[PDB]
Amino acid sequence: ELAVCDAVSGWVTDRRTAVDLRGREVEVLGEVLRQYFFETRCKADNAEEGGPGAGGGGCRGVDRRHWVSECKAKQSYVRALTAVGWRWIRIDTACVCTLLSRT
Amino acid sequence: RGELAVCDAVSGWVTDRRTAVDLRGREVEVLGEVPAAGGSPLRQYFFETRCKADEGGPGAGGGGCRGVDRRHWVSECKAKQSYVRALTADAQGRVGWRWIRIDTACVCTLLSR
Ligand SMILES: [Cl-]
């Protein structure tokens, strides 16, 4: 399905650091399986395509007549084996549109 | 200065998720408890973000989104999911780790035009 901010999703296999629930940087263990995270970010601009819905651009479909918008990454907490123990860490889970304005 | 979301969200620690959709589309059972994932035993819970359920205007779950140009676009605020590894079950109680789906955000979808 088509959205207002084009998302790009994947498996993060090399995350070694992350900011935890307290605002601090914690070491992310490389394995436990082997420790992965499912991450979601915004699409980056593409020179053949252009137009809206990308990474730090105006969101597809918003009315430019009344609004100024921006696709930005949204974060959530995932349980992670860190350093040693399970800690909640911030990972990118979506590209959401924000209306910062009132054109 | 006063940033508004296009779709309103509600986040929180879910401690009652008992079912989920796994990575391949199957519905599985999600356990409340995890016996030995760490060095120690622990309670299984998730950090989820889903749409707010609402007359009083748009930007609510199932509704049109805030700030979308209603002239050209049919839209809708819907939960969007990410995969997380979780202790689950399937056969008659055959437990194991599975990548499953959780609500990670409420996003504005563009249905047509
Ligand atoms: Cl959005």
Nearest to B84 by CA among B10, B40, B34, B9: B34
Give the Cα-Cα-Cα angle A44, B74, B66 (nearest 5 degrees): 70
| Resolution (Å) of this entry | 2.8
Hey, is B90 helix, strand or coil?
Answer: coil
Q: Report the alpha-carbon distance of residue A78 to residue B20 in Å, rounded.
A: 16
Interface membership of B99 toward A (CB under 8 Å)? yes
Task: Provide CATH code, domain B1-113.
Answer: 2.10.90.10
B69, B82, B85 ranked by CB distance to A93: nearest: B82
Q: Which CATH superfamily includes the segment(s) A1-103? A: Cystine-knot cytokines (2.10.90.10)
Technique used to solve these coordinates: X-ray
Contact A45, A34 (CB under 8 A): no
Q: Report the alpha-carbon distance of residue A21 to residue A88 in Å, rounded.
A: 6
Domain positions in chain A: 1-103
- Residue B55: C-alpha distances to residues A3, B58, B60, B69 (Å): 25, 9, 11, 20
- Residue B60: C-alpha distances to residues A5, A33, A43, B71, B106 (Å): 18, 39, 25, 19, 9
Q: Report the alpha-carbon distance of residue A89 to residue A81 in Å, rounded.
A: 9
Rounded to the nearest angstrom, the gap between the alpha carbon of residue B52 and the centroid of all alpha carbons in its chain is 12
A88, A94, A99 ranked by CB distance to B67: nearest: A99
Rounded to the nearest angstrom, the gap between the alpha carbon of residue B51 and the centroid of all alpha carbons in its chain is 9
Q: Across the interface, do B108 and A67 touch by the CB < 8 Å criterion?
A: no
CA dihedral defined by A44, A49, A50, A55, rounded to 10 degrees?
Answer: -20
